[PDB]
């Protein structure tokens, strides 16, 4: 009875935990202990959505919830470059766990087809395919289901658009018997890798959408919900590790959570002997009473981190007590404390939509909603400008000549200046004409002091001034103001016509999931090499994965 009811669940259990264990061969920031995985199980089996007294479908709910929450709790502490790899591996486990023909030969060609030997001296037609495309097609021609691809490419000579140029991830030509949709996705992914390697990430994303559901990775795009995670699913003796990339931190997030939950935190900066004594005293008092304690810049004392982890393991603390450790991602952090704690990686958000969502979540509602009624539109414009100039940093050195740090502090200063100048100009009036807004004051201040203070080059200053002059006029709040031109052919991201913060948030959420650097103003081909090398990095990480399974 137990075998025929719950064997595949246990097989998926072992596979998922050993994927989590072998996951450390990527970035060394995360090492996961078995207690983490058993906490995931005690979340799944005892916090059950649709809690439906039918075991046959209840097991399916348990398995789906297992995959979803494993991805959630593991990818909250992983860089955005590896979310696709982890989701792909989870999809591989799900595929192996189901009547589906396991296409091991096709996955092997997908992974190590680049590393396999190919023919020499074979020069196919250069009618529409370059030498590397021809080499990839020759390498893929060894698959039994894909033999007459050389014939088929000139057979469909009119298919020079869905297989070359444009955005081929949606519709792909040619054919692999009525195939299972997952098998069609696998063959189409092989075609994408062979023809257009720059769309490999999008193709893998929609493969995961077809396999584990289209809303599998939607929770990564939303801003982090620290309140529920800290107050619900974190053990009191588990330190809340908050690792972050240079240029961005989490101390403000901890202070905001402290203010919201009405819990007092003693904040200590690590690096002095008095700081160490304060940290020990605060940790002991916190264990005795219960109030939270956060240690800052923790990565500067690994020798102290060793006995910090040992002391934390050897104590039984208060119920409502949490310890936060903010640090940068460094190799000096001990793997003991990396295993003991729970890791939340903090990085610049991916995409304009996620960036503006994070900004609007960060700013409280009472700040935006205050009189006059134009403050909401001004804050929306500021958020869009901040998101655009932050997202232009990824495509360096085209977006910016230097890798600046346009962090949250600059946005906070810009919001403060906007608020103060609005309060100066409007003497408590409910509405203000768009012509009377201090546009010159805002533009000059944010071009010379707040955002342009960090700018070195005159050309970068010119670019920032161009952005500020283009965005901070809007023909004085005219309707149908074009924020950008998403596609050269008939696509403009015009201004939302709403006047309220809720309307602005609804417009932000309703932005399409697609994004190209033409949103930012860059050429659409700026991201091509980055996406190609990121797909190659994903393939290399996967080869790192399955490797564990005279001069």
């Amino acid at each position: 009875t137990v075998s025929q009811q719950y064997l595949p669940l246990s097989t998926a259990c072992s596979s998922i935990y050993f994927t989590m264990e072998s996951l450390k061969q990527i970035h060394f920031l995360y090492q996961y202990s078995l207690q983490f995985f058993l906490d995931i199980y005690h979340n799944v089996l005892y916090e059950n959505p649709n809690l439906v007294t039918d075991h046959t479908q209840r097991l399916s709910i348990i398995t789906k919830d297992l995959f979803q929450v494993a991805f959630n709790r593991v990818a909250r502490g992983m860089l955005h470059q590896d979310h696709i790899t982890f989701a792909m591996l989870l999809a591989r486990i799900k595929l192996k766990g189901t009547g589906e023909p396991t296409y091991d030969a096709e996955f092997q060609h997908f992974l190590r087809g680049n590393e396999i030997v190919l023919s020499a001296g074979s020069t196919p037609r250069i009618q529409g395919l370059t030498v590397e495309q021809a080499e990839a097609v020759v390498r893929l021609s060894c698959l039994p289901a894909f033999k007459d691809l050389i014939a088929k490419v000139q057979a469909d000579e009119q298919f020079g658009i869905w297989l070359d140029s444009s955005s081929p991830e949606q519709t792909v030509p040619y054919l692999w018997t009525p195939a299972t949709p997952i098998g069609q996705a696998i063959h189409r992914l092989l075609l994408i890798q062979a023809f257009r390697p720059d769309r490999l990430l999008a193709m893998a994303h929609m493969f995961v959408s077809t396999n584990l559901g289209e809303s599998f990775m939607s929770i990564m795009e939303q801003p982090l919900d620290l309140t529920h995670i800290v107050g619900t699913e974190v053990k009191p003796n588990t330190p809340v590790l908050m690792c972050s990339v240079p240029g961005y931190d989490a101390s403000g997030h901890v202070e905001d959570l402290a203010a919201e939950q009405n819990t007092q935190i003693t904040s200590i900066a690590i690096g002095s002997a008095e700081g160490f004594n304060q940290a020990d005293k605060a940790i002991n008092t916190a264990v005795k009473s219960g109030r939270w304690v956060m240690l800052k810049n923790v990565h500067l004392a690994p020798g102290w981190l060793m006995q910090l982890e040992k002391k934390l393991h050897s104590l039984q603390p208060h119920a409502c007590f949490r310890l936060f450790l903010t640090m940068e991602i460094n190799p000096k952090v001990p793997v003991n404390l990396l295993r003991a704690g729970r890791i939340f990686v903090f990085e610049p958000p991916p995409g304009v939509k996620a960036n503006m969502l994070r900004t609007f979540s960060s700013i409280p509602v009472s700040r935006i909603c205050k009189s006059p009624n134009e403050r909401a539109r001004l804050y929306f414009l500021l958020a869009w400008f901040h998101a655009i100039i932050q997202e232009r940093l990824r495509y360096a050195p085209l977006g910016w000549s230097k890798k600046y740090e346009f962090g949250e502090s600059d946005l906070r200063s810009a919001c403060d200046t906007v608020d103060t100048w609005l309060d100066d100009t409007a003497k408590g009036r409910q509405n203000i004409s768009p012509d009377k807004i201090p546009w010159s004051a805002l533009k000059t201040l944010m071009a010379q002091s707040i955002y342009g203070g960090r700018v070195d080059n005159e050309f970068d200053q010119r670019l920032l001034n161009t952005f500020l002059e283009r965005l901070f006029t809007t023909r004085s709040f005219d309707s149908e103001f074009k924020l950008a031109c998403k596609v050269d052919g008939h696509k403009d991201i015009q201004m939302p016509d709403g006047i309220r913060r809720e309307e602005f948030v609804q417009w932000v959420e309703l932005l399409p999931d697609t994004q190209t650097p033409s949103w930012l103003g860059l050429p659409n081909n700026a991201e091509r090499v980055l996406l190609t090398t990121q797909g190659v990095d994903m393939i290399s990480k996967m080869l790192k994965m399955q490797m564990l399974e005279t001069l």
Binding site: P397, L398, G399, S401, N457, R462, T466, G521, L522, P523
Partner: protein, 46 residues
């Protein structure tokens, strides 16, 4: 001694070594704001 677009000339593709500025002549329908935002520049070695 005595629209137009001021294009920087960088030494290499890293664009960290500005050398000299060039004032080119724009076409009929192109726009200097688009030229600035798109990051058009001149490379010295590539």
């Amino acid at each position: 001694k005595q629209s137009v677009v001021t294009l920087p000339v960088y030494l290499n593709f890293t664009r960290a070594d500005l050398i000299f500025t060039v004032d080119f002549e724009i076409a009929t329908k192109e726009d200097p704001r688009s030229f600035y935002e798109r990051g058009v520049a001149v490379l010295c070695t590539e």
